[PDB]
Symmetry: D2
């Protein structure tokens, strides 16, 4: 068993849906963070990368046929660098971290890239082919942007509710009121904006040439009254709104991950050690609390408890979802949960988010001069991933 | 690091394109082999599955949004069973074995499923969204069935050549003659048909109710004459034909993978131990020989040489590709390669293939009363995977 | 008013949906009947054709952009020959007859072609474009084969019911039983088969080279018992079946129409005079009876009554629709309706039907040595057209 | 032979492509001008309309399935009002005037509506259907906005050149210089801008509630220099530009057309009498001059020469086209041509244009206290229509 380190973590600013990165193909987003990784580490010879992992919740569009591999090629890396793309929907970026982590831990790799990428803007349509010639009926052109598509008839209907509907149920079940959601959403915008303004993300940001963003595009100067005025998006009497739900976003993130040997090879002091990982799945209709058990597992494997954490990166698919996770965990000091904001403000380009929050967890642990960090991400269809870092 | 075993390995017969499985949604194919794994192992409580890994080279269709998870839900498994879908194109099924292997080896899991699924028949169309309203020109509706789509303008042209064109290049470069390819293709059909007839595949086969197959549908009674008569598929003067290339196919394979504790929990004797794996990447236009270093790496990691192998599953993307791999492995006896035929005859549903050949390797080593096995699979954009098994 | 004659009338056999003409582009269907008209009248100089009218209820596919003109060009006809395509849905082929008839009657033309064409097999899909970039939702890919599509929200819902649903209501309203409908459907098949067998359609048939049909493909050897066994197509308790409804079909018909000057110029003895025409419109949900008033109008304008008709060509959209028209035409002897069968058996390639029945009415009148004929056709959104012929 | 009058003529302003009317479904555009005809003539009982004719060059989208009928229904006219849609491409709106004219002239109708409608913004995509199940290669999704689509392989290539390219050859063949075209284009903008400002179109305009247009949206304040600055749109060395070519446009136009009895019944004094019409067809590649013979025919049928005309509405598909027509009408004083501008400035929503220019001509003739007017329109696959009016 080999210790595994985040050597570097970088990501584009996240574009909002149809926003500043909506013109950037997802394979180019992935290629770009790879480029950025190589740029950021002159001691990194890309040929030394044993495998490139990219989380990608879609892949039907321009990121098709294994975006990790395409990205390495597009980044100008040697064709000897393998790549694999992983889909654990919303958590795919953290799955790729875990996948790379495992590859190195078992000695299959010394140096790996774990990225995540989503262009939700350029999520294409998918049209099923007819099984017979001259189909007569109207077909559905499925948008891959959001939600279920080409739903299996045998799939229990209660599991195919929208993520927002599921999260409404979770909010109702766990008593996550609209005000707590909006308070959590507001804090996300406040901390994300402050983190950006104070240069907190400078360490982890690569700008797309010609598509620069001063900060994550979904970050707003908003207010409790502004969020309170929004209409519910999933139920007429609902609590989830566009303001306390994550946006749909574009972006990519990539982490350089190696063992101690790779760290010296590349010439980089690890941001943090990947200690442990956890995965959990729940009823799809409460997917937002998917990470609850995953985080418990990761913490236990790391030999620590909630009190040992100095940073929690809990991906904010929805304020309600994040709050429900927090309600199922021991009280965490608010200051440590998404200290620099989260996906409500920063954006949630599915494949990218799980890599981003591990990467920014690592940077944050580096800024704090050490400590235990937990990154946890809920997944659609009811899963959760968690990674424990230690600097 | 824990020893990891293939506890069971099952697959559907593979349907040919538009063939006997073409009416079965790929998420249903994956769900079927999961159901079959649970039926096959009465001591398997599906709640014991820590993760479900499915290789899937496509996933834009009915298998969208993490088919591994979809499959587990569709199989009636507890919502607690997580699922992750991996794309290393044609090697995805073996990537997923390796993913599962690593998860258990590091102790993140004790029991896992590593499957692969592809419905190449039902590979949908993909239509990119317009960035602007009221686009004016004719658009391309991309088929996801084969080859490149929504090609990045920056992707080197030489790397986007068709798999067959690349294999023609590899055939020429390594002197793989048309007769040699067709001899290898003929042997694939003969061995596959014989294996079916002699019950060799009964250990690994699950029938789809209502879509049963007497044998893998692409298996033909054929001859050197019939093969030599075929027109070239990729060049007027070419060597690759429909006959010495794998078909496009539909199928799923799934392996129950566990450590010793899982084997005891599930009450199953390991078919074989997963000893090691390799990954390699090469110029995309020589993808056919992608497995070469991967096998070498895997063998090195397993502490064995080619002489120690008693079975090799070399996935038969193209006879020429496969023969080129054997040439670059001079020390390998070609008569222990694909003893029961391969993908030329059995079919090549991309995502399932890498799982199938590991699974059938395990069964073969079980039939032979033990020994070292190598499974190797080339991947389309210049990659290769290899797994070494020991019973 | 100038007297206007049907100089010739030809049609392809009608192929069944996805049947023998499904490989023929509709513009080629139309061009073929133009070539046939030209072949059939050696005295016809195509340059003498003042205008080509084609009924076509679709036109979204390969018959797009004025199939009439396209067909004239594809038929080798001089570029001097104008062409116009008319859509009065199911009655479009009769509309073009009337259009040609009017053009000549007023002296805008002396010689015209009135055709109708439909390739219901090749009826394409229509995808509306997004008004903004990066559309988010699932879109409908509308089949143009059948029914309403791209339905205006403001269209009264009662009017957007399917033709079969509407005709179920009409069947209930007018007491047209299942057995009555099947008897009329049987009658259609028997008379159509008999007409073909006896060479009655030889006078009007042109065969597509390479897609020849022994007879109209939808004609079957059926029986009261087979028809009674058929399941209802539009309600669990309904009376309309696939057997007592017209099929979906492909086919083209074209009539050479001219005044006496044209008749002499072309060297053709008129089959029949086009005496009069009627149009009417009803609630879309009783479209089946749209012809009722249209026929009354045409009869009144011809100065004749139901008494005086020796042949009625009532397009058989549905047995129940045709029977309802008969009930509402109590002075009409049902016996003289569709003596050579109708669309239930011959097929109903929308655009072609209204021209076919006028052309076959002219031939029948010719066979009978003269008399008054009425052709009437119901139209999908609540219309009806009728033409009175006299030889 | 009954005298036939334009009793009213109305149109929407024309929005440009993607412009102010781009949110209005074409059937609603058509329905709107119908509602306006009813609103404008309170003596009009819409049930008195015997037939509604609409030119529509597309019909693939929301105006599918006989937009004339659909529009009558959507306008809330009695379901007894029939409707028919006509496609002679660019000339469809004039075809429909002619169709209504003929219906009344022969006594089939007393009161008719002749409309034209086009939403080129909302021109949908069409996807041909597979003849066989599970098609495998990329497909073309055809836009119906402009030009040829689903081209017949048997159509001579010479006839499938774009409209711009054809007009380039015509402009070359008839020595129509860039400057001459731009002068004509400038003049169209100047006269159309002036006509709007002076209130000239107020008599014929109906605004779409919520989509009001101060004037036709393609009218611009332009200049000889701005037009001279434009780059050629169809050849490197070309003379045709986006500025001397019509735009793509949305709009609808509708004429209330009746005999003297209808005029008295609706309580409307005729704007003009429809005296005659012409149709002609030419080689597709010189379609711009299609109207030339059509106008000659119509004049000769009206008993007049060019000298007699006080107004000519020549549809401006291209300045070069329009000038070549003028060139071939040597006895036509070009200064009476499009006195209020033309399609270069007003816009060219194909199906609407032929109705608009007849309608505008009627209004202009009314505005001048009588006279002879000619409307002519070239048509894309080599045709032309002409209508002679007289007040």
């Amino acid at each position: 068993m080999t210790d595994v380190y985040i050597l570097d973590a970088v990501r584009t600013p996240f574009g909002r849906y149809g926003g500043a990165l909506s013109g950037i193909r997802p394979d180019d987003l992935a290629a770009h963070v790879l480029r950025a990784l190589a740029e950021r580490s002159p001691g990194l010879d890309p040929a030394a990368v044993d495998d490139v992992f990219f989380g990608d919740a879609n892949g039907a569009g321009e990121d098709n046929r294994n975006v990790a591999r395409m990205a390495a090629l597009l980044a100008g890396w040697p064709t000897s660098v393998p790549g694999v793309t992983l889909n654990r929907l919303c958590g795919s970026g953290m799955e790729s971290v875990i996948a790379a982590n495992r590859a190195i831990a078992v000695g299959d790799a010394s140096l790996a890239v774990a990225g995540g990428v989503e262009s939700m803007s350029r999520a294409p349509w998918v049209l099923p082919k007819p099984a017979q010639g001259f189909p007569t009926g109207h077909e559905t052109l499925y948008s891959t942007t959001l939600g279920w598509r080409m739903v299996n008839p045998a799939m229990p209907e209660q599991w195919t509710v929208s993520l927002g509907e599921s999260t409404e149920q979770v909010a109702a079940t766990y008593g996550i009121s609209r005000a707590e959601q909006d308070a959590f959403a507001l804090r996300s915008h406040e901390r994300a904006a402050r983190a950006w303004a104070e240069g907190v993300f400078d360490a982890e940001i690569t700008q797309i040439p010609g598509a620069e963003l001063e900060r994550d595009e979904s970050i707003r100067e908003t207010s409790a009254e502004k969020l309170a005025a929004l209409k519910p998006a999933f139920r007429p009497d609902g609590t989830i709104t566009a303001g306390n739900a994550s946006p749909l976003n574009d972006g990519a993130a990539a982490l350089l991950i190696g063992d101690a040997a790779a760290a010296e090879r590349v010439g980089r002091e690890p941001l943090a050690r990947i200690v442990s990982r956890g995965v959990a799945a729940v009823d799809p209709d409460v997917f937002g609390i998917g990470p609850v058990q995953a985080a418990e597992i990761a913490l236990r494997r790391a030999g620590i408890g909630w009190d040992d954490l100095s940073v929690v990166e809990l991906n904010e698919a929805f304020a309600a979802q994040s709050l429900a996770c927090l309600k199922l965990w021991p009280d965490l000091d608010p200051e440590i949960v998404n200290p620099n904001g989260g996906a409500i403000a920063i954006g949630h380009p599915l494949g990218a988010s799980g890599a981003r929050i591990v990467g920014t967890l690592a940077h944050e642990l580096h800024r704090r001069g050490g400590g235990w960090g937990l990154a946890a991400i809920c997944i659609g269809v009811g899963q959760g991933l968690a990674v424990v870092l230690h600097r």
